[PDB]
Subunit: 117 residues, 4 copies
């Protein structure tokens, strides 16, 4: 049940489609940051996970360039899909910015987002 | 600039193609871990970077299931490309595994990879 | 308002004293992992934070060895303290284990802990 | 053999002292960022590590406030010590700034440092 619309604790919107070959496709809208409207994403996931009750591993990427603006940055979300009464996706993310060699030490932010429907 | 074959410090081979629309397609082979042979990747990149000399931000994802085996895991690489005499892709990554909720605290590994020609 | 007893979402107990010298001293009890009983901690914090409302930056370290056990690992917590009606300490952590360099790529877990009163 | 002067790939200086009880004490100077001169550090380490050839786990913290300035920030380094002809300390670090509740998503940087003599 990964396919569908999800929201994280910041109020961002994540619209996902789960391919039977393990593909991920959709749209992302950030409530925060140097962004506006939708941005394209793509990723992959385990299409044959364990049935001992483990969650489903997954990942996806967004580059913050669209028709309206460029932050010159990209984010990847890595985490696992969890089912049951209340399904959620728990992730941790990295946000890298394009920088000069001078400032590369401070190019990457880390954090975590939690998504539900 | 990005399209082509790259190798990281572990012996792993990353074979990429960067579409002009910001898309990333290719193959990945890991020198290490619960893997063998090639795996499909996909990702995104800033197809309109700065002219001030900044690097080119990008990211990509790999789910470790192919026709030979399934580790039930996925990695995302977030970083930026740097060109010139010595071209490199400098990244940090997240490797998340499918876990029970009891062990979810130990579900995600962190690291860094450097890619060169 | 840092000194005192805190608990995180795992049910771990974090007992801290904030000295005026920017120092952090205390004990830690983990509800999870290769652990039993208390372990020593020590850290640092901004003893002169902004008055604009920003949080209080801080961090602390724990090596998992005590009279009862040795897990051959260490965790660092980095975050900020936030006061008011409901005070919290928001962190991200790095848990590193001793390994052979062949397995060095799988040496480091990343996570986040939330601490309340 | 953790005690001694080390430098990272940025040319920052790490002056460390390992107490017999698993304590770490010393000074830190950053070649970069919002800082100048020496800053106090404290941390812990595994004082009875495995003999199978694994590295020694360790960690330490620095709050970026001293007699000359205050960044309102702290960094924690988590990693392990590795001995031999090329003795090194391999780390990943987290750098957190004090922020408002609104800007917390951009409060924490991650990277990696390599220390040698
Ligand atoms: O500021 C940028 O460079 C682009 C916007 C970044 C928004 C980030 S991605 C991680 C986090 N989760 C969200 O929903 N928004 C922020
Ligand atoms: O072990 C697994 O479950 C999957 C194999 C992952 C190996 C990792 S991905 C990050 C790092 N870079 C590599 O080239 N290999 C490792
Ligand atoms: O090496 C071990 O197995 C013990 C690690 C302790 C469990 C971790 S430390 C980070 C996180 N926060 C907690 O309260 N527990 C886990
Ligand atoms: O917050 C600041 O502006 C001062 C901190 C300086 C950044 C650091 S800590 C990680 C990295 N390693 C190092 O030696 N210097 C930078």
């Amino acid at each position: 049940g990964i396919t569908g619309t999800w929201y994280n604790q910041l109020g961002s919107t994540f619209i996902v489609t789960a391919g039977a070959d393990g593909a991920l496709t959709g749209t992302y809208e950030s409530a925060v940051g140097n962004a506006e409207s939708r941005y394209v994403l793509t990723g992959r996931y385990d299409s044959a996970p364990a049935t001992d009750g483990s969650g489903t591993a997954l990942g996806w990427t967004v580059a913050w360039k669209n028709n309206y603006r460029n932050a010159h940055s990209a984010t990847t979300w890595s985490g696992q899909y969890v089912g049951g009464a209340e399904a959620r996706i728990n992730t941790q993310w990295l946000l890298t910015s394009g920088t000069t060699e001078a400032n590369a030490f401070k190019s990457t932010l880390v954090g975590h987002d939690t998504f539900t429907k």
